Design a protein around this ligand. Structure first.
Ligand SMILES: *[C@@H]1O[C@H](CO)[C@@H](O[C@@H]2O[C@H](CO)[C@@H](O[C@@H]3O[C@H](CO)[C@@H](O)[C@H](O[C@H]4O[C@H](CO)[C@@H](O)[C@H](O)[C@@H]4O)[C@@H]3O)[C@H](O)[C@H]2NC(C)=O)[C@H](O)[C@H]1NC(C)=O
Ligand SMILES: *[C@@H]1O[C@H](CO)[C@@H](O[C@@H]2O[C@H](CO)[C@@H](O[C@@H]3O[C@H](CO)[C@@H](O)[C@H](O[C@H]4O[C@H](CO)[C@@H](O)[C@H](O)[C@@H]4O)[C@@H]3O)[C@H](O)[C@H]2NC(C)=O)[C@H](O)[C@H]1NC(C)=O
Ligand SMILES: *[C@@H]1O[C@H](CO)[C@@H](O[C@@H]2O[C@H](CO)[C@@H](O[C@@H]3O[C@H](CO)[C@@H](O)[C@H](O)[C@@H]3O)[C@H](O)[C@H]2NC(C)=O)[C@H](O)[C@H]1NC(C)=O
Ligand SMILES: *[C@@H]1O[C@H](CO)[C@@H](O[C@@H]2O[C@H](CO)[C@@H](O[C@@H]3O[C@H](CO)[C@@H](O)[C@H](O)[C@@H]3O)[C@H](O)[C@H]2NC(C)=O)[C@H](O)[C@H]1NC(C)=O
Ligand code: DGQ
Ligand code: DGQ
Ligand SMILES: *[C@@H]1O[C@H](CO)[C@@H](O[C@@H]2O[C@H](CO)[C@@H](O)[C@H](O)[C@H]2NC(C)=O)[C@H](O)[C@H]1NC(C)=O
Ligand SMILES: *[C@@H]1O[C@H](CO)[C@@H](O[C@@H]2O[C@H](CO)[C@@H](O)[C@H](O)[C@H]2NC(C)=O)[C@H](O)[C@H]1NC(C)=O
Ligand SMILES: *[C@@H]1O[C@H](CO)[C@@H](O[C@@H]2O[C@H](CO)[C@@H](O)[C@H](O)[C@H]2NC(C)=O)[C@H](O)[C@H]1NC(C)=O
Ligand SMILES: *[C@@H]1O[C@H](CO)[C@@H](O[C@@H]2O[C@H](CO)[C@@H](O)[C@H](O)[C@H]2NC(C)=O)[C@H](O)[C@H]1NC(C)=O
Ligand code: NAG
Ligand code: NAG
Ligand code: NAG
Ligand code: NAG
Ligand code: NAG
Ligand code: NAG
Ligand code: CA
Ligand code: CA
Ligand code: CL
Ligand code: CL
Ligand code: ZN
Ligand code: ZN
Ligand code: ZN
Ligand code: ZN
Lengths: 692, 692
């Protein structure tokens, strides 16, 4: 038979291993010749594997690169203007790769150029609350200072935005061993920890879903009209540069001014973590000088788009997408994901060659320029938005397959919770101690749900990956899954976006038997298989009703911190609770009808109701000042692009409301956002009502 | 059999006549008890007639009414402040209706209150070009003047916007006999002409598709958050009032200052049509004083929504809608349309009672508050936008069925041209001299197409009626049809929006045998029947390809008035012509496939391609500063809401471009609009490509 089991059995750990090795021998930086060559290889192989059609879709987007003959670096300068200490110009390359060329040195993509010089202020993680503590409590003024901030907790782009709004004239980002060095493990190459010379690359844009900074709304195709740089979306106004903890120690050790306000501000280096501004007595005349010469350049990028045409509903698209561009070798990010996708395509293609086709069309994507702001996925979705709007069933992301070796991690729409439960109960756990047990059992044991005993944690989608345009802009049901660490016993993974992320890191330290990679291929691939093959779409609307009530309870409790204002301004959540109650009731009736209907019009009518349910949460007017975040239930947090926020319009209207100078106007806007959310929930519910 | 012929034969002229008489005995002003009573009567009757469900949908929207105990009027005042002449407080009521109560006196709905006093300037029709001629050529300054303008040529709301931008402190609108008195016909009640005491009512908003001024984006339901009046959409800033030509003569006769610039500025009254400012020598010390005391009030309105559930595709909606609210008796506007809708519902219901059902669902609507800004249709569509987006096949409007007795008038999407041709060839002409001939033959004879011999004129949709939200906001294929006058041998119809629009006007002067009403019922009803019953949707994509080329040629020729700027700024239309060529090619291939496919998935897949083709022209970002006009091919003219403009984004970027102070920036924006139009055309074309 050709069924899910056949698909799943054809997947092989040894193949994922071969593909990972193949994808990680040279850097594949977006916009470079090497990454175009890999795109062409993937296109050829997907054709060989049996897909009906495989095309490149290219765009010309703004990218950013250091100047090869004018390197970026930071100095401490004395009062004579002698640079007495300079940060490193490159990470020491890993063993056996010391002769690879075109390793891009560490830099912050899209930094403007400049050579600002000034006194340092240390701002902890540069979070909104860290700046509140500095300015409101400690009375420290960042205006015209250079801020130094440790990586971790929140997206680096939010750190830069926060520093910029505080009046900083530059930002230095560094990796503290408190966040990137796990106790009892050695530094690369002898373990999976970040060495003192290691540096995390990464873009520092605040795109809010726009895609290419120059063409918001429309694909960056051959005839595109582009904004001028001054009107570009999301570019920072002050220079930024990342360093490792050897260099950070040299910048931090002379810090004077105020002591850190509490221990949550101290990392693991042998320095006091003084906030400043400036250096102690003896060195008070020395300053810090940045030298940034990176340039922004419009550059061609290439997505690979593979099609496996559906046998019955070819006009319904189930999409499996992940990126191909990497900062350097991409051993985990993204090639651990791309190797999994490659094996999934191979397995589907094996079935196709035997005469099988999925019920619905499956689209496979190898996105470019994800590291520069989700540019390749976003431009392609802007190009194809009408097809995606009306035909998109689901999007499953496929970036890094592992960030640890402990248990599964899933973030997805509630419409996929039941699908994920049912699938993981049919898969074998790869974990030691759980041989012969299901993945559901091991995952539920290691990562229990905080709400329900006997069920695993599944999180909201945030952002910082290629599902953003599909989910928060277009309203297509979306999900992602990877293996992860025990969060209960450091930040992401230590070698994230460093030159040390290699094939050897994965094969030696994370997944020597490629069993976690194989399990992740079974989860991502099994989800795509069910979405594209199941007669009735595998979405349960009742799961959305349950989370909508949780989110309503949560946003109500935030508001009820201000009981006197809610009385004065007549702030009522009754409309929202009413809408959520109605959604619960209507979803329950729709589910009965879905169980209780040979009629392919009723089926497809009801499949269309299921498909367009995520779509009903989109507001074509967008959220305030964020027109490409249109989903009313979920947006990336205004304070941390990686984290999801529920009822974001209401959340942001309530945030720090007690500081607003005109409370009537601020509470008016809370009420406006309650109305918009209640209306959108009721409107979504009514899409599940009988159609006539 | 139950086929179109059965439907069409059941329609009766005598029924339309009975319903018109029934709907026009008392005023049905929006927001009044009488109009709520008529809504309840229509709901009961549509149930009786056999519809599956008939509901009221109510909203609380901003309306406007004169103050009963403080009437609006205009004076000429002498230097002592004596009001030496006052305009009338009411139109003389027509014979037999002199005791009807609650006839609203003439007023301009949504005028602010004020008692401005000043010198008059006469501005012809107050069009953009009339203000250009005044200010640029004649050097006449309107700042702080009261402007007097004749009705006609363009929507009155555009006149008020133009006067306001010129700095006027008030606007007087009047009906000139040149535009509202046809030679050789007598005044009501002895003919169909406007008497000297007759006055055209009407709103003066500039909503640009927003709906209720207080709730743009969202339905004005029970928990709606409303803007304050100061932030309301579309309200005028200066007082406005309409008068008849007896009163206008008294205001115009003393006018001095400059002579009219040419004969196109002179109407038919015995006055010189001097532009002013102010009065001649003897009277130069007299002024004009307005007294406006109308109030804006949030008021409940009621739509009637009738459903005839489809047998095969109940989740596909074909909508027949027209309004019910009137200024006074509504003899033509809207009840000549509503009586036609009522008979259409009756006929469909007769078939239903015999066991018939349409293939697709038909929705019937009696909209409220159309006269106050398309409020009832727009609020209901904001409420139901997700259902309409994903399920709306077509919208057929049904306002006034007659504005003359000469020939047919159709404005619609090109997707309906072939449908309208085929239908009118099967209908009998009602015209004298064409007995035994088709409606197509008589219409083609009297109103020949300007492009193709042997075909009738069909116009673009403009606006100023209830299709606006469905077509230009939501992108649902839309059409309208009525009987009209010979435009070749006055403005609209003379008694438009006056107390003299009565049952007797229609029965005595326009359509004594109700044969034009019956033909219009056959056209509107036949279109709804084919849209809701035809196995393949009756849309021909190739007709869009033909008009897109015409519109591209037209917008290119406008730009080519500025050859030197197109060279300097590298302004190319090549991308747009390329997109139109591609649309032509792809539409031709789709048509072949549509002819050449027993498979209901392929059918419904291709019906979905047909349904979503109009939808593909919507840009979710809207046009500049007009977020509710989203259709890229068609918007209401920025200078005249009634007229349609093609490629409106490019048209407005080119308009008066030679006057812009920064030509680089102005031509940049032309290029941006070319890119947006070319992209949207190509994206629409690609929705017709093979789906996988
Ligand atoms: C969740 O679902 C329920 C449906 O089960 C839905 O109930 C609806 O609530 C609306 C809004 O409250 C009701 O609106 C009323 O409708 C009647 C006519 O049917 C009007 O007379 C009412 O207005 C009068 O009373 C008001 C309230 O005091 C006054 O402000 C007003 O001035 C009038 O005097 C009122 O508009 C509607 O009838 C029900 N529909 C039902 C019960 O079927 C509820 O709205 C849904 N929740 C959300 C968030 O949509
Ligand atoms: C109408 O339909 C046709 C398809 O039949 C479509 O043609 C496409 O045009 C685009 C845009 O011109 C072509 O883009 C090219 O693609 C190749 C790779 O296939 C690139 O190498 C080309 O770029 C080079 O040359 C450029 C132009 O001089 C340089 O600016 C650039 O720097 C590169 O050197 C170029 O991007 C595309 O191949 C075709 N597709 C075909 C023929 O199948 C046309 O775009 C459609 N019209 C619209 C408005 O969409
Ligand atoms: C995840 O798996 C569960 C458990 O298998 C699925 O729920 C089950 O789905 C079936 C199919 O609809 C239900 O069967 C129905 O039972 C009723 C009798 O009560 C009958 O009328 C129907 O004709 C049909 O046989 C079954 O009750 C249900 N079990 C539950 C809800 O506990 C679930 O659908 C899966 N989720 C997916 C696929 O997203
Ligand atoms: C308006 O009426 C015209 C004329 O009747 C309709 O066009 C006709 O449509 C039919 C049905 O698709 C075409 O018939 C086809 O002919 C080909 C052979 O060439 C055959 O392969 C198909 O199986 C089918 O029999 C016919 O050619 C066509 N005539 C034309 C285009 O001149 C038109 O569709 C109607 N418009 C509507 C309904 O919107
Ligand atoms: O532009 C854009 O938008 C983005 C791009 C890029 N892209 C990536 O890279 N991407 C990745 C990472 C993220 C993640 C990590 N990170 C984490 O995981 C986390 B976040 B939250 B908290 B925060 B901390 B705890 B929680 B989560 B956890 C930790 B962090 C993944 O997706 O894979 C970046 O970012 O740079
Ligand atoms: O608010 C809005 O938006 C609207 C509302 C209301 N609504 C109506 O009333 N509506 C009607 C009328 C119009 C038409 C008449 N008008 C005409 O027809 C015309 B327009 B254009 B030119 B101008 B002149 B030649 B052409 B067309 B013809 C003449 B006028 C119809 O639709 O029926 C008004 O307007 O007030
Ligand atoms: C990764 O694998 C691919 C596929 O085998 C290798 O590309 C092939 O290289 C051989 C020998 O040089 C050629 O004959 C083929 O034309 C290539 N096939 C393609 C590009 O589809 C590629 O060289 C491998 N990369 C590494 C680093 O091992
Ligand atoms: C830090 O780097 C700078 C720049 O390369 C070094 O300063 C330069 O030193 C050379 C040779 O001594 C001079 O000719 C240049 O004029 C200097 N440039 C600048 C910008 O000062 C500096 O010596 C380095 N510092 C350390 C400690 O290595
Ligand atoms: C218009 O027609 C309707 C429908 O016949 C009339 O309404 C009916 O009036 C009779 C007698 O007063 C009542 O018994 C019915 O209950 C009414 N039916 C309804 C409202 O559905 C209405 O009076 C007529 N109006 C005019 C001016 O003739
Ligand atoms: C125009 O109307 C005004 C207002 O009704 C008339 O002026 C009023 O006349 C009465 C009685 O003579 C006075 O007591 C009021 O003080 C006047 N009001 C104002 C605002 O002036 C005026 O007579 C009318 N003019 C004509 C020619 O009829
Ligand atoms: C890189 O280095 C210097 C900076 O002035 C210059 O010679 C060259 O133009 C630069 N390259 C750029 C800016 O791309
Ligand atoms: C901090 O920085 C400078 C001091 O020169 C000043 O202009 C700015 O207003 C200060 N802000 C606060 C909040 O103290
Ligand atoms: C792999 O799993 C082992 C066993 O728990 C653990 O000690 C080790 O830290 C893991 N490696 C990584 C990179 O997480
Ligand atoms: C109508 O007339 C006067 C205007 O001041 C006043 O007595 C009454 O309040 C007015 N009605 C309104 C404003 O609705
Ligand atoms: C016209 O009106 C007043 C004259 O007081 C003046 O303020 C305004 O600027 C004038 N405008 C033009 C264009 O002449
Ligand atoms: C009705 O038609 C006759 C015959 O052409 C014409 O003379 C008359 O003007 C028409 N009536 C109206 C209101 O157009
Ligand atoms: Ca773009
Ligand atoms: Ca509204
Ligand atoms: Cl992922
Ligand atoms: Cl109409
Ligand atoms: Zn990645
Ligand atoms: Zn990354
Ligand atoms: Zn009307
Ligand atoms: Zn009207």
């Amino acid at each position: 038979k050709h069924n899910m089991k056949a698909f799943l059995d054809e997947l092989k750990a040894e193949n994922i291993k071969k593909f990972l090795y193949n994808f990680t021998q040279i850097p594949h930086l977006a916009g470079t010749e090497q990454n175009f060559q890999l795109a062409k290889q993937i296109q050829s192989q997907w054709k060989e594997f049996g897909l009906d059609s495989v095309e490149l879709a290219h765009y010309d987007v703004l990218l950013s690169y250091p100047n090869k003959t004018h390197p970026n670096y930071i100095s401490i300068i004395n009062e004579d203007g002698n640079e007495i200490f300079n940060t490193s110009l490159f990470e020491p390359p890993p063993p056996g790769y010391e002769n690879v060329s075109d390793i891009v040195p560490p830099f912050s993509a899209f930094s403007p150029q400049g050579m600002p010089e000034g006194d340092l202020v240390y701002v902890n993680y540069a979070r909104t609350e860290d700046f509140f503590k500095l300015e409101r409590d400690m009375k420290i003024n960042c205006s015209g200072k250079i801020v130094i901030a440790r990586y971790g907790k929140v997206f680096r782009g939010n750190k830069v935005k926060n520093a910029q709004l505080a009046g900083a004239k530059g930002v230095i980002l560094y990796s503290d061993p408190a966040d990137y060095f796990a106790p009892g493990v050695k530094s690369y190459p002898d373990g999976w920890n970040l060495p003192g010379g290691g540096v995390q690359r990464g873009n520092i844009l605040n795109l809010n879903g726009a895609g290419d900074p120059l063409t918001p709304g429309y694909p960056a195709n051959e005839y595109a009209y582009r904004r001028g740089i001054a009107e570009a979306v999301g570019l920072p106004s002050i220079p930024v540069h990342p360093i490792g903890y050897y260099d950070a120690q040299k910048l931090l050790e002379k810090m004077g001014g105020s002591a850190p306000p509490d221990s949550s501000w101290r990392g693991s280096l042998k320095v006091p973590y003084n906030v400043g501004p400036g250096f102690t007595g003896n060195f008070s005349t020395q300053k810090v000088k940045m030298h940034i010469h990176s340039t922004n350049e419009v550059t061609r990028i290439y997505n690979v788009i593979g099609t496996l045409r559906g046998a019955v509903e070819p006009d319904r698209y189930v999409i499996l997408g992940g990126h191909r561009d990497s900062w350097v070798f991409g051993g985990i990010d993204p090639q651990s994901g791309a190797a999994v996708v490659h094996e999934i395509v191979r397995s589907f293609g094996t079935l196709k060659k035997e005469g099988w086709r999925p019920r619905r069309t499956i689209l496979f994507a190898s996105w470019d320029a994800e590291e520069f702001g989700l540019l390749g996925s976003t431009e392609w979705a802007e190009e194809n938005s009408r097809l995606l709007q009306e035909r998109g069933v689901a999007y499953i992301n496929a970036d890094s397959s592992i960030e640890g070796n402990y248990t599964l991690r899933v973030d997805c729409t509630p419409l996929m919770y039941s699908l994920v439960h049912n699938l993981t109960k049919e898969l074998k756990s790869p974990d030691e101690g759980f041989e012969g047990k299901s993945l559901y059992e091991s995952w539920t044991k290691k990562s229990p749900s905080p709400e329900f005993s006997g069920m695993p944690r599944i999180s909201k989608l945030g952002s910082g990956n290629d599902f953003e345009v599909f989910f928060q802009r277009l309203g297509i049901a979306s999900g992602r899954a990877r293996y992860t660490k025990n969060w209960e016993t450091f930040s992401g993974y230590p070698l994230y976006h460093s030159v040390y992320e290699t094939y050897e890191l994965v094969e030696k330290f994370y997944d020597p038997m490629f069993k976690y990679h194989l399990t992740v291929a079974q989860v991502r691939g099994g989800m795509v298989f069910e979405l594209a093959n199941s007669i009735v779409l595998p979405f349960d609307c009742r799961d959305y009703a349950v989370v909508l009530r949780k989110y309503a309870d949560k946003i109500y409790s935030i508001s009820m911190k201000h009981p006197q204002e809610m009385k004065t301004y007549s702030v009522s959540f009754d409309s929202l609770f009413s809408a959520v109650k109605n959604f619960t009731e209507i979803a329950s009736k729709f589910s009965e009808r879905l169980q209780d209907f040979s009629n392919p019009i009723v089926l497809r009518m009801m499949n269309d109701q299921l498909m367009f349910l995520e779509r009903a949460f989109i507001d074509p007017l967008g959220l305030p000042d964020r027109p490409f975040y249109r989903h009313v239930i979920y947006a990336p947090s205004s304070h941390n692009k990686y984290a999801g926020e529920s009822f974001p319009g209401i959340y942001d209207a309530l945030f720090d409301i007690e500081s607003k100078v005109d409370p009537s106007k601020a509470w008016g806007e809370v009420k406006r956002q309650i109305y918009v959310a209640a209306f959108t929930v009721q409107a979504a519910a009514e899409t599940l009502s009988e159609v006539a």
